Structure formats: C-alpha cells, structure tokens
Design a protein around this motif. Structure first.
Motif, PDB file in Angstrom:
ATOM      1  N   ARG C  16      37.858  47.696  43.275  1.00  0.00           N
ATOM      2  CA  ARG C  16      36.621  48.157  42.598  1.00  0.00           C
ATOM      3  C   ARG C  16      36.103  47.030  41.729  1.00  0.00           C
ATOM      4  NH1 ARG C  16      37.686  51.144  46.043  1.00  0.00           N
ATOM      5  NH2 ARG C  16      37.875  53.411  46.013  1.00  0.00           N
ATOM      6  N   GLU C  27      29.009  49.904  40.331  1.00  0.00           N
ATOM      7  CA  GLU C  27      30.300  49.728  40.955  1.00  0.00           C
ATOM      8  C   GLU C  27      30.149  49.524  42.449  1.00  0.00           C
ATOM      9  OE1 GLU C  27      32.446  53.471  41.568  1.00  0.00           O
ATOM     10  OE2 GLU C  27      34.384  52.640  40.868  1.00  0.00           O
ATOM     11  N   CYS C  29      32.775  48.992  45.969  1.00  0.00           N
ATOM     12  CA  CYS C  29      34.078  49.483  46.380  1.00  0.00           C
ATOM     13  C   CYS C  29      34.456  48.960  47.770  1.00  0.00           C
ATOM     14  CB  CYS C  29      34.077  51.010  46.476  1.00  0.00           C
ATOM     15  SG  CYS C  29      33.324  51.856  45.068  1.00  0.00           S
ATOM     16  N   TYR C  36      30.952  49.387  49.730  1.00  0.00           N
ATOM     17  CA  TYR C  36      29.999  50.488  49.514  1.00  0.00           C
ATOM     18  C   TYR C  36      29.756  50.659  48.020  1.00  0.00           C
ATOM     19  CZ  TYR C  36      34.092  53.496  48.610  1.00  0.00           C
ATOM     20  OH  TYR C  36      35.272  54.012  48.141  1.00  0.00           O
ATOM     21  N   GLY C  38      29.775  52.673  44.702  1.00  0.00           N
ATOM     22  CA  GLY C  38      30.542  53.782  44.129  1.00  0.00           C
ATOM     23  C   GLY C  38      29.739  54.662  43.194  1.00  0.00           C
ATOM     24  N   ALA C  39      30.380  55.720  42.739  1.00  0.00           N
ATOM     25  CA  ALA C  39      29.746  56.726  41.868  1.00  0.00           C
ATOM     26  C   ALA C  39      29.516  56.228  40.461  1.00  0.00           C
ATOM     27  CB  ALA C  39      30.598  57.995  41.826  1.00  0.00           C
ATOM     28  N   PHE C  40      30.280  55.230  40.010  1.00  0.00           N
ATOM     29  CA  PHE C  40      30.224  54.863  38.589  1.00  0.00           C
ATOM     30  C   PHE C  40      28.823  54.354  38.191  1.00  0.00           C
ATOM     31  CE2 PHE C  40      32.306  53.730  34.562  1.00  0.00           C
ATOM     32  CZ  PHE C  40      31.419  52.836  34.008  1.00  0.00           C
ATOM     33  N   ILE C  58      44.845  57.221  42.384  1.00  0.00           N
ATOM     34  CA  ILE C  58      44.404  56.130  41.452  1.00  0.00           C
ATOM     35  C   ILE C  58      43.769  56.728  40.192  1.00  0.00           C
ATOM     36  CG2 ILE C  58      42.102  55.824  42.482  1.00  0.00           C
ATOM     37  CD1 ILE C  58      44.467  53.059  41.096  1.00  0.00           C
ATOM     38  N   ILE C  60      41.596  55.140  36.950  1.00  0.00           N
ATOM     39  CA  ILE C  60      40.844  53.980  36.508  1.00  0.00           C
ATOM     40  C   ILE C  60      40.272  54.210  35.104  1.00  0.00           C
ATOM     41  CG2 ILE C  60      39.036  52.306  37.064  1.00  0.00           C
ATOM     42  CD1 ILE C  60      39.000  53.578  39.944  1.00  0.00           C
ATOM     43  N   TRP C  75      38.317  57.767  35.588  1.00  0.00           N
ATOM     44  CA  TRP C  75      38.456  58.342  36.943  1.00  0.00           C
ATOM     45  C   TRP C  75      39.883  58.866  37.062  1.00  0.00           C
ATOM     46  CZ3 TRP C  75      35.327  59.604  40.925  1.00  0.00           C
ATOM     47  CH2 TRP C  75      35.977  60.121  42.070  1.00  0.00           C
ATOM     48  N   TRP C  80      33.835  60.838  37.249  1.00  0.00           N
ATOM     49  CA  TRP C  80      33.946  60.054  36.016  1.00  0.00           C
ATOM     50  C   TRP C  80      33.750  60.936  34.795  1.00  0.00           C
ATOM     51  CZ3 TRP C  80      35.844  55.195  36.090  1.00  0.00           C
ATOM     52  CH2 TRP C  80      35.823  54.532  37.313  1.00  0.00           C
TER      53      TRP C  80
HETATM   54  C1  LIG Z   1      40.075  58.314  45.487  1.00  0.00           C
HETATM   55  C2  LIG Z   1      39.012  57.623  46.282  1.00  0.00           C
HETATM   56  O1  LIG Z   1      39.212  56.503  46.680  1.00  0.00           O
HETATM   57  N1  LIG Z   1      37.822  58.193  46.388  1.00  0.00           N
HETATM   58  C3  LIG Z   1      36.780  57.552  47.170  1.00  0.00           C
HETATM   59  C4  LIG Z   1      35.397  57.936  46.685  1.00  0.00           C
HETATM   60  O2  LIG Z   1      35.070  57.447  45.349  1.00  0.00           O
HETATM   61  C5  LIG Z   1      35.170  56.024  45.111  1.00  0.00           C
HETATM   62  O3  LIG Z   1      36.480  55.665  44.706  1.00  0.00           O
HETATM   63  C6  LIG Z   1      36.863  56.198  43.429  1.00  0.00           C
HETATM   64  C7  LIG Z   1      38.287  55.784  43.052  1.00  0.00           C
HETATM   65  C8  LIG Z   1      35.877  55.733  42.360  1.00  0.00           C
HETATM   66  O4  LIG Z   1      35.907  54.311  42.281  1.00  0.00           O
HETATM   67  C9  LIG Z   1      34.476  56.204  42.684  1.00  0.00           C
HETATM   68  O5  LIG Z   1      33.505  55.772  41.755  1.00  0.00           O
HETATM   69  C10 LIG Z   1      34.106  55.678  44.078  1.00  0.00           C
HETATM   70  O6  LIG Z   1      32.818  56.207  44.456  1.00  0.00           O
HETATM   71  C11 LIG Z   1      34.350  57.433  47.714  1.00  0.00           C
HETATM   72  O7  LIG Z   1      32.962  57.767  47.331  1.00  0.00           O
HETATM   73  C12 LIG Z   1      32.801  59.200  47.167  1.00  0.00           C
HETATM   74  O8  LIG Z   1      32.671  60.006  48.360  1.00  0.00           O
HETATM   75  C13 LIG Z   1      32.113  61.301  48.116  1.00  0.00           C
HETATM   76  C14 LIG Z   1      32.116  62.241  49.331  1.00  0.00           C
HETATM   77  O9  LIG Z   1      32.957  61.724  50.376  1.00  0.00           O
HETATM   78  C15 LIG Z   1      30.683  61.070  47.668  1.00  0.00           C
HETATM   79  O10 LIG Z   1      29.930  60.525  48.757  1.00  0.00           O
HETATM   80  C16 LIG Z   1      30.586  60.132  46.460  1.00  0.00           C
HETATM   81  O11 LIG Z   1      29.227  59.757  46.192  1.00  0.00           O
HETATM   82  C17 LIG Z   1      31.383  58.837  46.660  1.00  0.00           C
HETATM   83  O12 LIG Z   1      31.290  58.179  45.393  1.00  0.00           O
HETATM   84  C18 LIG Z   1      34.697  57.821  49.148  1.00  0.00           C
HETATM   85  C19 LIG Z   1      33.761  57.091  50.085  1.00  0.00           C
HETATM   86  O13 LIG Z   1      33.161  58.143  50.861  1.00  0.00           O
HETATM   87  O14 LIG Z   1      36.019  57.474  49.464  1.00  0.00           O
HETATM   88  C20 LIG Z   1      36.945  58.126  48.578  1.00  0.00           C
HETATM   89  O15 LIG Z   1      38.261  57.782  49.004  1.00  0.00           O
END
Ligand SMILES: CC(=O)N[C@@H]1[C@@H](O[C@@H]2O[C@@H](C)[C@@H](O)[C@@H](O)[C@@H]2O)[C@H](O[C@@H]2O[C@H](CO)[C@H](O)[C@H](O)[C@H]2O)[C@@H](CO)O[C@H]1O
Ligand SMILES: CC(=O)N[C@@H]1[C@@H](O[C@@H]2O[C@@H](C)[C@@H](O)[C@@H](O)[C@@H]2O)[C@H](O[C@@H]2O[C@H](CO)[C@H](O)[C@H](O)[C@H]2O)[C@@H](CO)O[C@H]1O
Ligand SMILES: CC(=O)N[C@@H]1[C@@H](O[C@@H]2O[C@@H](C)[C@@H](O)[C@@H](O)[C@@H]2O)[C@H](O[C@@H]2O[C@H](CO)[C@H](O)[C@H](O)[C@H]2O)[C@@H](CO)O[C@H]1O
Lengths: 89, 89, 89
Positions: C16, C27, C29, C36, C38-40, C58, C60, C75, C80
C-alpha cells in the motif's frame, strides 16, 4: 529547510538502508553489520518512501521516489534497481 | 506541517510514532493499552525510523535530520544512544 | 513534491502506497495482479504508515498531519476508522 529520509531493515544483523532526498537527488547509505557505505541507489526525487520484505534469504525493496506529482517505483530484486509498474492512475 | 514516522512490531502490536514539531522530535507509544509519551527526545526537523526484533527484544533506529545533517539514534533495550551513521549529504 | 509512505506484508507481496498531494492523502494498492486505487481518502500534508498481521488479516495505521494536528486512521478489516492516537498529553 531539511533533507528527507526513509529507512528500512531486515534480518537480525541487521541490514539497514537509509534513503535521503536532498536538493532533488536521492542517495542511499547501507549497513550490513560492519560499517556504513554508499549504496548503488542514485535516482532523482524530492521525496522518498521505502518498504521491503524477505522471500527466504532474498531481500526485495521498493523505493517510491517523487518529483512534483510524479512518483517512480524502483525495485531491488537481488541485483539491480529496475523501474516498477507503479502508477498514480 | 509537523512530520511523522512510524514503526510497529509483534502482533499486539507495539507502535512507535515519532513527530518532528518545531525542531524537536518526540515519541508516542502504544503497547496494547493506551498511548503514552516515550523516552525519545532529540532535535530534528525531519524523522524516519526502522525497527527489527532479535527474539522478543526490539531494536529501533531513528534518523533525525536538520538541514543536510542526519543523526542516528539507537534503542537496544537500555536507553537511546547515538549511532555510527554518517552521510556527507 | 508529493509526500509518500509505503507498507507491505506477506510474500506476494501486498503493498500500500499513501500519497499526500495538495492536502489530500490517497492510496494505491498492489496484491500481485496490478495496481488499483484503494478506499483510503483523508486530509493531510504529511503521511506515515505501519502495518502488522493478526493471522492472515492485515491491520494498517496511517498518521496524517496538517499543521500541528496528526490524526490516526485504522484499517482492521471493516473499512477505515479514526484511531485513539493523540500527539501529546
Ligand atoms: C483485506 C484486503 O486486502 N482488502 C482488499 C480491499 O481493500 C484494499 O485493501 C485494504 C487492506 C485497504 O488498503 C483498502 O483501503 C484497500 O481498498 C480491495 O478494495 C475493496 O474492494 C471492495 C469490494 O470488493 C470495494 O470495491 C472497495 O472499494 C475496495 O476498496 C479489494 C479489491 O477489490 O481487495 C481486497 O482484498
Ligand atoms: C515490471 C513489472 O511489472 N514486474 C513484475 C513484478 O512486479 C514488481 O514488483 C511488484 C511487487 C510491484 O512492486 C510492481 O509494481 C513491480 O513492477 C512482479 O512481482 C515481482 O516480480 C519480481 C521479479 O521481477 C520478484 O519476483 C518479486 O518477488 C515479485 O513480487 C512479477 C510477478 O508478478 O511480474 C513482473 O513482471
Ligand atoms: C516509558 C519507558 O521508557 N518505558 C520503557 C519502555 O520504553 C518504551 O519503548 C521502547 C522500545 C522505546 O520506544 C522507548 O523510548 C519507550 O519509552 C521499554 O520498552 C519495551 O520494549 C519491549 C520489546 O523489547 C516491548 O515492545 C514493550 O512493549 C516495550 O514496553 C521497556 C523495556 O526496555 O522499559 C520501560 O521502562
């Protein structure tokens, strides 16, 4: 004002790498248990961050070097610094 | 703005956040049970940090910079001491 | 220049990268298959980060600073959230 530094380490010796961004250039100082030395990393940037991980005995390092809004990922995967896939998109 | 550096270890976890504010770096600590102000108190406008475990014992290196001058501070279980790090910069 | 912070975990690895740009931290990722966004998304001029695993999960912590105020963002698997961190007594 001042330079900006980033640091990472691994193992139990340990190995340490300190990256310093100074007047648009990033340089690297290294410790592997027996004195500080100047490392191979020498790339442009006003800001630096770093992370690393081991895969067994092999160290992998990612340095994020930024000038303005442009961040370039530099990758150490055992033998040299290569440009990574990172983009801001 | 103030500038920070963070490290953590183990799985509780323990966290150390170093903040450079008006030329002084101070340390805030989490060991599972609330934040407190730690022993680290050294001069700097910029800070970075790395840490590693040797068994259950933490070792921390803090890199404090003012202008182009960087000073290393060492935690090895019994107080903060000046390290051997140099960088011409 | 923008200001970054990076963390990584596992052996893939997962990475990240947090970028403070014009007062906002965002953010990017990597989980082994392309970068891609991230949500942050939080305010800050300066940023640091640390992370640790609890089992495979994880955790964070991002330290976002503007002026003399640092906020901790967490996280823990559920989105968040604001952390308990305060900078001073
Ligand atoms: C635990 C994990 O890895 N979660 C991933 C999702 O979130 C990302 O990783 C976490 C640890 C943080 O760094 C977040 O800020 C970061 O986005 C990741 O994205 C989430 O997916 C959701 C629905 O599948 C949604 O789309 C959301 O907007 C997105 O942030 C997903 C990628 O699809 O992988 C997860 O593993
Ligand atoms: C240029 C490129 O895209 N290389 C790929 C490797 O990706 C690099 O490392 C990852 C962790 C991120 O920092 C990427 O932005 C960066 O480009 C990628 O994964 C890595 O391969 C390394 C050897 O090149 C090494 O084996 C490392 O252990 C591994 O994490 C690999 C495998 O997907 O593909 C490359 O193309
Ligand atoms: C208030 C104080 O000085 N407490 C001591 C602990 O010190 C704190 O943590 C260390 C690592 C530094 O960041 C100090 O500046 C900070 O004040 C100290 O540390 C302990 O380290 C353990 C692992 O080796 C473990 O993580 C534990 O949670 C942590 O408390 C202990 C032992 O050296 O002494 C206290 O007096």
């Amino acid at each position: 004002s001042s330079v900006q530094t980033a640091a990472t380490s691994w193992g139990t010796v340990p190995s340490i790498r300190v990256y310093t961004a100074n007047n648009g250039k990033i340089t690297e100082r290294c410790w592997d248990g027996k004195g500080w030395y100047t490392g191979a990393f020498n790339e442009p940037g006003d800001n630096v961050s770093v992370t690393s991980w081991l895969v067994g005995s092999a160290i992998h390092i990612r340095v994020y070097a930024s000038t303005g809004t442009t961040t370039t990922e530099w990758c150490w995967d055992g033998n040299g610094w290569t440009k990574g896939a990172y983009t801001a998109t």
